[PDB]
Structure formats: structure tokens, C-alpha cells
Task: inverse folding
């Protein structure tokens, strides 16, 4: 068909981002799910790197790296805007996205290997964001953006990460989580595997 | 407080040279504070929380690190001349090529400056295999000078210092692109004295 193909993980944190963005753009995509057990021959030629998900294929153009995909989707499908307009705000947005992947997505990898230092570090970091959400309903923005597409998959996996939010700042973050998860686009972007993380853990 | 942007650049740093090239291409003037691994200033220490804290651009209350972030900021805040394509598909390709240069080649250049002899050959084998694309276009997958060339110009300049010489077939196209790249007045203006000294002493 004349429709984009997405090679996605079933439980992958970065594949969930792309799926959330495609839902926010309202675009229909053919999703082929890939496991660590077996990575398809089609994807094997299209993606040269060990980590193969997410990969978006469209006509001639093949793209990997999740932020490259997310920025392409925002440039190809402008409505609704998931990035700010002015270059200063766009710089800050990109920088926050960089620091979320470097400081927190890395911690989560360790938390899946049951690191308790990383678990405490991520909880402390998440709770420190509380004074942002007393200013703006979303991350440093009045409107939902791509930075919220970094935080939403991460904060969804918080019971599975063994993280329970209490103390000062919990009320503010939990409200932000409500604004994030109650979105129809978020609920539609969930795989059954991703849905099973909440109601079991 | 000062009404001009401040770049915290390295003297021989690869990613600092990218940012310096882009600022030269945009024609915008900047107070450049040079930093060594020996000592990093109190100002820079407060704004950047990472071990490797160069390049760092500081503008009013906005601090930016990561070279690709800074380079994209500069292209968006200073539109003339455009160093990125207009259409979304071309922009995605450019970003992917910029991603692969840093993942595949810039990683080898880290290993060369340490010890590695294998990384020297791997970078040589990488560049010479990409030689047919330079026959197609005057710049890397582009008819005009883009940010992809801003990834290649710090790399190919240091090619005598890496110990890689133009070898066999394909190297005619590489050197012709290199001479097209290095003879830009923006490139020569972006070079530090340390970076100039790599050319003559190797």
C-alpha cells in the first residue's frame, strides 16, 4: 500500500515515542513488530546498526534514530505543532530532549537490570520537575510537545520501574501524568504489552 | 550581560570546529572563549553539567550544548544562507547522514588520537568507499554547501594528522571535494592556529 511502514518494538521506550507522535499526527501507518529473538531480513538490510527499532520506511526514504523520525514527522505533518516556532524555544526543547535521553533513558536501562541506585536517581530527578508544572501544564510549554513525548513513555513505565512517588512534588507530577495519559492519542499508541505494565505491576 | 553570543570552544576540538564553521558561514560575530582539558572556567562549569563541556554557546539566558543542537539553532535563528534543505524528506536524509558521520567516523577519530591503527584503516576504507557520491554532486548529497559538509570539513582537514593519505582509485574525487571545501573563505576564517598547524606539520 501507499502507506508508511514502521518497524517497532512491542515494549521499547523509543518505539513508543514514534507511535505516540504518529497518533498525535493522526496518520495511519503499517506497524511490523520486531523482537530481540528475531529481527526480519527486510529490516536487516534497511538498518545497519545493532539496535534496529524504531525504523520508519516511506517510499524511497528510510529513517532510523527516534528523534530524527519524530522531527521528520513534525516537518512532514505540521498539524498539530509538536515543536515551538521561535528558534530559542526550539533550542531549549531539543536540549531538554537531549538531557532526557542522556540522563534518564540511560537510568531506565539500568533499572530494568534492577539497579537500585538508578531507581532512586530517576525518582529524585522526576520529583525535581515539580516547580515547572506549577507554571505550564506541559513541559515548559502551554501546549503538548515532543518533550512530553519523551516523558510520557518514561512516566508510564514507573510502576514497572518500581518507582512510587511520594513527598513534596508528587501531587504536581501525578497531575502532569493525568494530563499526559488521559489523552486519546496516548491510549491509542499503547501496545498490549505496554498496557500490561500498569495493571500487573 | 554582554550583547554578543559567547562560544566556549576547544582549540583542536572536532565538534567545536563545526560550530565555528557555521558561525563563519552565517557571518555572525561571537566572543570565543577557548578551553583546555587542563582547566574549565567557573562560568562554563555552572551552565554545562557534563564532563565534555565544549562546544557551548551562551546567548542572553539561553545556554546550548551538543554541536548538532547548536548548529541547528544557528541555522534557524540566522536563516541566511540556508545550511539545511527545505523539504522534510531531504532534511531527514541530511540528519541521518550527519548522524552516521558522527556514529561511524567521528568515533574512529577518537580512537586514532588515542592509539588505534585499525581505526586509521577503517576511516580510510570508509571515505574511499563513499567516493562515487562525490561524482554526483559538488557537495555531500547536495548541490550547495550544507551542514553535512560542516561534518566533513573538520574531519578531512585532520586527515594528515590521522595518518590517512589519499590511496588508490576514488581519491581523485575525494581530494577535489576537499579542495572545494578548504578553499572556502569561511573555512579558513573558522580555523584556529592549532588547527592550521596540523596541515603543515603532517
Result:
Amino acid at each position: 500500500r501507499s502507506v508508511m511502514t514502521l518497524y517497532s518494538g512491542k515494549d521499547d521506550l523509543k518505539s513508543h515515542q514514534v507511535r505516540l507522535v504518529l497518533a498525535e499526527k493522526g496518520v495511519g501507518v503499517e506497524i511490523t513488530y520486531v523482537t530481540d529473538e528475531s529481527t526480519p531480513e527486510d529490516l536487516l538490510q534497511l538498518n545497519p546498526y545493532p539496535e534496529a527499532k524504531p525504523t520508519l520506511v516511506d517510499r524511497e526514504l528510510v529513517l532510523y534514530n527516534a528523534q530524527i523520525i519524530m522531527e521528520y514527522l513534525d516537518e512532514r505533518f505540521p498539524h498539530p505543532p509538536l515543536m515551538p516556532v521561535y528558534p530559542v524555544a526550539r533550542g531549549t526543547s531539543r536540549l531538554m530532549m537531549y538531557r532526557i535521553e542522556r540522563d534518564w533513558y540511560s537510568l531506565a536501562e539500568k533499572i530494568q537490570k534492577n539497579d537500585a541506585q538508578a531507581r532512586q536517581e530517576l525518582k529524585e530527578g522526576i520529583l525535581s520537575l515539580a516547580p515547572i508544572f506549577a507554571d505550564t501544564p506541559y513541559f515548559m510549554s502551554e501546549e503538548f510537545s515532543l518533550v512530553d513525548c519523551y516523558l510520557a513513555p518514561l512516566l508510564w513505565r514507573l510502576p514497572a520501574y518500581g518507582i512510587d512517588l511520594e513527598g513534596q512534588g508528587a501531587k504536581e507530577i501525578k497531575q502532569y501524568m493525568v494530563r499526559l495519559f488521559e489523552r486519546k492519542t496516548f491510549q491509542d499508541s499503547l501496545t498490549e504489552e505496554e498496557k500490561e505494565l500498569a495493571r500487573n505491576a
